[PDB]
Amino acid sequence: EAPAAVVTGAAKRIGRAIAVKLHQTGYRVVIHYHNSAEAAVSLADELNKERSNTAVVCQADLTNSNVLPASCEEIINSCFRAFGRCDVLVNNASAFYPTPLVGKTVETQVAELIGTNAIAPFLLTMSFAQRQSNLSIVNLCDAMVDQPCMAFSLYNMGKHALVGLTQSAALELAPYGIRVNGVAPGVSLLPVAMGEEEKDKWRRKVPLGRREASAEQIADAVIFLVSGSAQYITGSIIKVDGGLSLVHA
Amino acid sequence: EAPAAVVTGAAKRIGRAIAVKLHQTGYRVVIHYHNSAEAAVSLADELNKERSNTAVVCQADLTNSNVLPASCEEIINSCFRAFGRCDVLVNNASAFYPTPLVGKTVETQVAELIGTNAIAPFLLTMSFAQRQNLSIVNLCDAMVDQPCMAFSLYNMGKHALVGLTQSAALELAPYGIRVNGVAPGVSLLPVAMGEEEKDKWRRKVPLGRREASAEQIADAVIFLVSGSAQYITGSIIKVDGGLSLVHA
Amino acid sequence: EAPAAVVTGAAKRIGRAIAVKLHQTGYRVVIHYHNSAEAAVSLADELNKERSNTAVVCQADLTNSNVLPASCEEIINSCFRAFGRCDVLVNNASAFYPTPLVGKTVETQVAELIGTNAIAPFLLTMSFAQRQNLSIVNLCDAMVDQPCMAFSLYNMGKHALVGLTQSAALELAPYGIRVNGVAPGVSLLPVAMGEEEKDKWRRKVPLGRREASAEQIADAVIFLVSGSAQYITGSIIKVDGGLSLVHA
Amino acid sequence: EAPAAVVTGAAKRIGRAIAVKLHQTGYRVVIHYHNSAEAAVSLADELNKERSNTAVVCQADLTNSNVLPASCEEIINSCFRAFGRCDVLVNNASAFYPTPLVGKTVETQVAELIGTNAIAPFLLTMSFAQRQSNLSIVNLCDAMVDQPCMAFSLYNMGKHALVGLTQSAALELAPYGIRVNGVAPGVSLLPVAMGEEEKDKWRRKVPLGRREASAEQIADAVIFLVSGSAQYITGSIIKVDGGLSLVHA
Numbered sequence: 001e002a003p004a005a006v007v008t009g010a011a012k013r014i015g016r017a018i019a020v021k022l023h024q025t026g027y028r029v030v031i032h033y034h035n036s037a038e039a040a041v042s043l044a045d046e047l048n049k050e051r052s053n054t055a056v057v058c059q060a061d062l063t064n065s066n067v068l069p070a071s072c073e074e075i076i077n078s079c080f081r082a083f084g085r086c087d088v089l090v091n092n093a094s095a096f097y098p099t100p101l102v103g104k105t106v107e108t109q110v111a112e113l114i115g116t117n118a119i120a121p122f123l124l125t126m127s128f129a130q131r132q133s134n135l136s137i138v139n140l141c142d143a144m145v146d147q148p149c150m151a152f153s154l155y156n157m158g159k160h161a162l163v164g165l166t167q168s169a170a171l172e173l174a175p176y177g178i179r180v181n182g183v184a185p186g187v188s189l190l191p192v193a194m195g196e197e198e199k200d201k202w203r204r205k206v207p208l209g210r211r212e213a214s215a216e217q218i219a220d221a222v223i224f225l226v227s228g229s230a231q232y233i234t235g236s237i238i239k240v241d242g243g244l245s246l247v248h249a
Numbered sequence: 250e251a252p253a254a255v256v257t258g259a260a261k262r263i264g265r266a267i268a269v270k271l272h273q274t275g276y277r278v279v280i281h282y283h284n285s286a287e288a289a290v291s292l293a294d295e296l297n298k299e300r301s302n303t304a305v306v307c308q309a310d311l312t313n314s315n316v317l318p319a320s321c322e323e324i325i326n327s328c329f330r331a332f333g334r335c336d337v338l339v340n341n342a343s344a345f346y347p348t349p350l351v352g353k354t355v356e357t358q359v360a361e362l363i364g365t366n367a368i369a370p371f372l373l374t375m376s377f378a379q380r381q382n383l384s385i386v387n388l389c390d391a392m393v394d395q396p397c398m399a400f401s402l403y404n405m406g407k408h409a410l411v412g413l414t415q416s417a418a419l420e421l422a423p424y425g426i427r428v429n430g431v432a433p434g435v436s437l438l439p440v441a442m443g444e445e446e447k448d449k450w451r452r453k454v455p456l457g458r459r460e461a462s463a464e465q466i467a468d469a470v471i472f473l474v475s476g477s478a479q480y481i482t483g484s485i486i487k488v489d490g491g492l493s494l495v496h497a
Numbered sequence: 498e499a500p501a502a503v504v505t506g507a508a509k510r511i512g513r514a515i516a517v518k519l520h521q522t523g524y525r526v527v528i529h530y531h532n533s534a535e536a537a538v539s540l541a542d543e544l545n546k547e548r549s550n551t552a553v554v555c556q557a558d559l560t561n562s563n564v565l566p567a568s569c570e571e572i573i574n575s576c577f578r579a580f581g582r583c584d585v586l587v588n589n590a591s592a593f594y595p596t597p598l599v600g601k602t603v604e605t606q607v608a609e610l611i612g613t614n615a616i617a618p619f620l621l622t623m624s625f626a627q628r629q630n631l632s633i634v635n636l637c638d639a640m641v642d643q644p645c646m647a648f649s650l651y652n653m654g655k656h657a658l659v660g661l662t663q664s665a666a667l668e669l670a671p672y673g674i675r676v677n678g679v680a681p682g683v684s685l686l687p688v689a690m691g692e693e694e695k696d697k698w699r700r701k702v703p704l705g706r707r708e709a710s711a712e713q714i715a716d717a718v719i720f721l722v723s724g725s726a727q728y729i730t731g732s733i734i735k736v737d738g739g740l741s742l743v744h745a
Numbered sequence: 746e747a748p749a750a751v752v753t754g755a756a757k758r759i760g761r762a763i764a765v766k767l768h769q770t771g772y773r774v775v776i777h778y779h780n781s782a783e784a785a786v787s788l789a790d791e792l793n794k795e796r797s798n799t800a801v802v803c804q805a806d807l808t809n810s811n812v813l814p815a816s817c818e819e820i821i822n823s824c825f826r827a828f829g830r831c832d833v834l835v836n837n838a839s840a841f842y843p844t845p846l847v848g849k850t851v852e853t854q855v856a857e858l859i860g861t862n863a864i865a866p867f868l869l870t871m872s873f874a875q876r877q878s879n880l881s882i883v884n885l886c887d888a889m890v891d892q893p894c895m896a897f898s899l900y901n902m903g904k905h906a907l908v909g910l911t912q913s914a915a916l917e918l919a920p921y922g923i924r925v926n927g928v929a930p931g932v933s934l935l936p937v938a939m940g941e942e943e944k945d946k947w948r949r950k951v952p953l954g955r956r957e958a959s960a961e962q963i964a965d966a967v968i969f970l971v972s973g974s975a976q977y978i979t980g981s982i983i984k985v986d987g988g989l990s991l992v993h994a
């Protein structure tokens with residue numbers, strides 16, 4: 001019987017690449033999405049045509065609120081309903097936008113940036129563990145946490161809290177045989193609204209190849225961490241940044 | 250005239266010591282409190298006896314909610330109202346208790362632990378910078394990489410505080426605002442904790458097999474706000490007696 | 498065409514497991530040794546039984562001295578003489594004994610601990626890169642920030658090795674050479690160590706309450722040299738089962 | 746009885762400013778130098794003029810060799826000889842030059858960069874503690890240690906090893922009442938050999954003030970760590986870099 005994985009924000013980009021690669025490893029996947037309904041349905045269709053009844057979709061908003069604990073519990077329950085088990089959780093969904101210290105209200109920004117990056121992963125970790133072999137959780141972090149982008153405090157705080165969770169959950173869930181790890185990209189798939197000249201500026205900063213990581217290169221590290229080649233690894237953050245975090249100003 | 254300082258959770262323990270020591274150095278102080286009104290007033294009385302009209306109190310819940318941004322804005326305004334200036338912000342207030350992954354609802358635990366430790370300091374930082382030797386000092390934790398068992402949300406809150414310290418230091422540097430952290434290991438142990446558990450933590454400490462007094466924590470805060478630290482920003486000073494260096 | 502790998506201290510324990518797994522993956526291997534001649538030769542015969550002329554041995558002392566650069570140049574050259582190429586360098590050889598701050602002379606301790614853990618890896622890296630999916634893997638230590646009592650020089654050697662990993666990754670990236678690290682917590686425990694002391698360390702480990710097999714360490718090395726890690730440089734992968742996260 | 750301090754590389758720049766401030770704090774100082782004989786003697790004069798019998802000089806090469814343990818033993822002995830006590834050790838002396846992986850022999854480069862930045866500090870710490878209130882050691886580290894200069898491997902390795910010494914010695918010497926800390930400058934007094942356009946390039950990188958640290962601002966952090974306001978601080982490294990280490994590439 002095939003193991004099952006939950007991947008958050010899996011409709012497109014890096015989340016999709018992780019969902020695809022986990023499926024290619026033989027996982028049945030729950031494809032979580034928020035707004036991207038068509039891309040999520042289309043991804044599940046491509047994976048179900050490869051192997052029938054191996055991909056389902058699951059809609060949930062991961063913004064912080066008093067109903068968020070129930071939304072996260074349902075995401076996890078949707079895996080057990082469709083596949084009868086949950087072996088892997090991948091915390092990939094993330095809001096990303098500036099919040100300068102000097103549109104959306106601040107309480108909305110806080111709820112989205114901390115909710116998606118830290119609080120939902122915490123509640124998803126709770127539910128994953130409480131619903132319970134090679135069990136593992138993989139958190140999508142940020143290799144640039146110590147060298148943050150200007151005016152991204154709430155986003156930076158969220159990813160720092162995610163490092164804390166990864167270490168805290170690794171310690172506490174180790175007796176239960178659940179490994180908690182992280183993957184930290186530098187520059188991978190750049191924002192869609194980012195101009196090409198701004199893209200190349202960041203590409204030129206990368207020592208290894210002067211380019212960004214492909215989504216597949218991120219998914220490769222996720223797949224290593226969930227495999228039997230990493231059975232002793234827990235509380236480890238693997239940066240996949242091509243040397244970006246090593247370059248001085 | 251004299252510089253003014255905002256200290257959150259300043260009625261007792263580490264906050265009180267920071268407030269006293271800032272006052273002794275010549276600062277006028279806002280003593281923020283949530284539940285400890287009497288203690289806050291009695292501290293203010295003691296400081297006002299020393300120098301008239303140099304200490305005020307301020308009440309605010311720092312739990313995460315829809316009204317939190319306004320509460321943080323009024324704490325900062327309270328400093329400008331009393332003293333006409335705000336030079337130092339000390340983010341000391343902090344909820345601390347366990348949250349097992351496997352009583353208070355989880356949404357309330359999130360609101361208090363992430364609220365007091367990370368979100369309130371974020372909102373106070375915003376208000377501090379917006380209203381302008383200016384410095385902010387965040388009360389971190391030296392055991393962030395070696396967390397207490399079942400203290401996930403608290404650990405998440407303190408990790409986020411490190412992130413705020415670094416981000417704020419970067420963004421506020423052009424404005425002349427320095428942002429630093431002080432990370433206690435074991436200082437004044439929780440009032441609830443038992444003597445047995447207290448002495449266990451004390452023997453772990455390489456330096457003197459004792460805990461830090463609150464004023465040893467305050468000494469590091471006093472250094473960071475002074476002219477001796479004019480070039481220091483984005484730094485976190487451990488005050489743990491070597492505790493974080495000890496293996497399992 | 499089959500790639501080639503140099504593994505230092507490959508006669509026994511972790512280095513042997515790394516040598517075996519690299520060979521099983523399709524690498525031709527230089528098995529470096531210092532004193533363990535019989536074990537190194539025994540491994541080479543084992544591997545050459547599997548595939549003919551795919552393993553050679555290389556004797557060198559990796560203590561710091563004026564002949565160390567020449568020795569490291571010869572180790573790298575032996576891989577080219579045997580196999581016509583050098584694709585992978587694994588710095589595994591390591592001296593490990595206490596050096597109290599308050600037998601060997603101190604200058605021998607400095608030469609041995611800093612030589613094997615830091616200086617030889619630097620000199621091997623120089624010779625590796627100068628001779629050119631190229632990668633280097635350095636054997637670090639997950640407990641580098643929570644060090645064993647009275648192991649100063651060893652801790653210094655391992656800290657310096659983290660420095661080399663980061664510096665070489667930055668500098669050799671234009672050449673397409675990746676430089677990474679594997680950091681074990683508790684793996685294969687010392688040979689003469691009593692099971693009672695062994696169990697004290699095993700009990701410290703959150704994951705499974707046991708030490709890492711040499712094969713589990715080798716697994717992270719195999720991943721870092723593979724095509725699944727072609728964007729990974731300057732990274733240090735902990736294989737410690739959550740040990741570095743446990744407070745005193 | 747006024748306390749006594751050893752400052753290595755104390756004839757010029759940061760080391761000199763540390764020696765001066767310590768003297769102003771009431772310490773009697775040993776001025777260690779290697780080649781700056783005129784500057785060291787001149788400094789001892791100035792300090793002895795202000796307060797008689799408070800300053801001596803001590804010449805020593807801190808390059809790694811078999812005689813280095815003896816040289817370090819002698820530097821400490823020189824403090825006990827002049828002042829009858831030794832309360833503070835400041836490890837400031839340091840060689841700083843590129844060692845690309847692809848003018849001196851490599852063996853000489855290894856000996857100077859690892860010797861001065863790591864090994865001599867280790868042997869001085871050993872000799873200091875062997876001869877033993879508020880006793881403390883301050884190691885001059887580097888804020889840019891995880892974001893190193895290109896082609897500075899051996900220097901960077903030496904500074905990394907110095908962080909490890911600071912933490913190891915703090916742990917080990919704690920039962921003896923000896924605190925061991927570090928100060929990590931980012932951009933401070935820029936090297937003499939550097940061009941003025943390079944200097945401005947580095948100055949522009951600094952978030953706080955767009956300038957470098959004066960030697961005195963570095964000395965202020967050293968003075969704090971040796972004082973009674975830091976008697977619970979051990980194994981801590983204080984960055985004095987004006988936020989430089991927080992700036993991404």
Ligand SMILES: NC(=O)c1ccc[n+]([C@@H]2O[C@H](COP(=O)([O-])OP(=O)(O)OC[C@H]3O[C@@H](n4cnc5c(N)ncnc54)[C@H](OP(=O)(O)O)[C@@H]3O)[C@@H](O)[C@H]2O)c1
Pocket residue numbers: 008009010011012013014015032033034035036037060061062063091092093094095096112116140141142143184185186187188189190
């Ligand atoms: N891309 C990079 O260069 C880079 C660099 C460093 C770290 N990372 C990390 O790696 C991961 C993947 O990166 P990425 O660039 O692929 O991320 P992304 O495209 O910016 O976001 C991934 C998904 O998150 C979901 N999401 C956003 N807000 C949500 C909300 N409020 N509730 C529920 N879902 C929400 C979105 O799903 P829907 O489209 O369905 O709404 C989105 O597709 C992220 O966690 C990121 O932080 C990426």
Ligand SMILES: NC(=O)c1ccc[n+]([C@@H]2O[C@H](COP(=O)([O-])OP(=O)(O)OC[C@H]3O[C@@H](n4cnc5c(N)ncnc54)[C@H](OP(=O)(O)O)[C@@H]3O)[C@@H](O)[C@H]2O)c1
Pocket residue numbers: 257258259260261262263264281282283284285286309310311312340341342343344345361365388389390391432433434435436437438439
């Ligand atoms: N104590 C230690 O050994 C230690 C160790 C590591 C880190 N630290 C850090 O150092 C700082 C001070 O330590 P401490 O032990 O003195 O802290 P504490 O006693 O646990 O809390 C300090 C104050 O925070 C306020 N507070 C708590 N919850 C609040 C809420 N929901 N809204 C508004 N205010 C709230 C309280 O004020 P009211 O009484 O008025 O309600 C309390 O007096 C903290 O940030 C802590 O994380 C301390």
Ligand SMILES: NC(=O)c1ccc[n+]([C@@H]2O[C@H](COP(=O)([O-])OP(=O)(O)OC[C@H]3O[C@@H](n4cnc5c(N)ncnc54)[C@H](OP(=O)(O)O)[C@@H]3O)[C@@H](O)[C@H]2O)c1
Pocket residue numbers: 505506507508509510511512529530531532533534557558559560588589590591592593609613636637638639680681682683684685686
């Ligand atoms: N085992 C663990 O629990 C653990 C924990 C943390 C880190 N590590 C790291 O992982 C790596 C391997 O661990 P291990 O326990 O297997 O190592 P180890 O047995 O202690 O040493 C490995 C080899 O190093 C060689 N060596 C020692 N001194 C040498 C010298 N002066 N010149 C040349 N070679 C010398 C020896 O080769 P010969 O036999 O031929 O003399 C020895 O077999 C090491 O780098 C270690 O620091 C291991």
Ligand SMILES: NC(=O)c1ccc[n+]([C@@H]2O[C@H](COP(=O)([O-])OP(=O)(O)OC[C@H]3O[C@@H](n4cnc5c(N)ncnc54)[C@H](OP(=O)(O)O)[C@@H]3O)[C@@H](O)[C@H]2O)c1
Pocket residue numbers: 753754755756757758759760777778779780781782805806807808836837838839840841857861885886887888929930931932933934935936
């Ligand atoms: N300046 C900065 O921007 C900066 C940045 C980061 C870290 N730091 C650290 O802060 C400390 C002070 O910096 P600095 O710029 O003042 O250093 P520096 O001027 O480059 O060197 C300090 C002293 O070290 C001595 N020295 C050099 N090689 C020696 C050897 N082989 N044996 C014995 N002594 C030797 C020299 O003494 P003599 O003149 O008598 O020969 C020199 O005066 C250093 O440890 C440095 O690594 C400085």
Ligand SMILES: Nc1nc2[nH]cc(CCc3ccccc3)c2c(=O)[nH]1
Pocket residue numbers: 093094095096142149186187188189190191202
């Ligand atoms: N969720 C999310 N989180 C993120 N963290 C970092 C990124 C993109 C990396 C980047 C950051 C700043 C400028 C150019 C490229 C990113 C993203 O695109 N989405």
Ligand SMILES: Nc1nc2[nH]cc(CCc3ccccc3)c2c(=O)[nH]1
Pocket residue numbers: 342343344345390392397434435436437438439450
């Ligand atoms: N807010 C707050 N935050 C805190 N962090 C740590 C403490 C108490 C000291 C301590 C630290 C680590 C383990 C046990 C006890 C503490 C506290 O008493 N209040």
Ligand SMILES: Nc1nc2[nH]cc(CCc3ccccc3)c2c(=O)[nH]1
Pocket residue numbers: 590591592593638645682683684685686687698
């Ligand atoms: N070279 C070498 N380096 C090492 N670092 C750490 C170890 C063994 C792990 C250990 C360290 C201290 C006490 C018990 C077990 C070890 C070893 O066995 N060999």
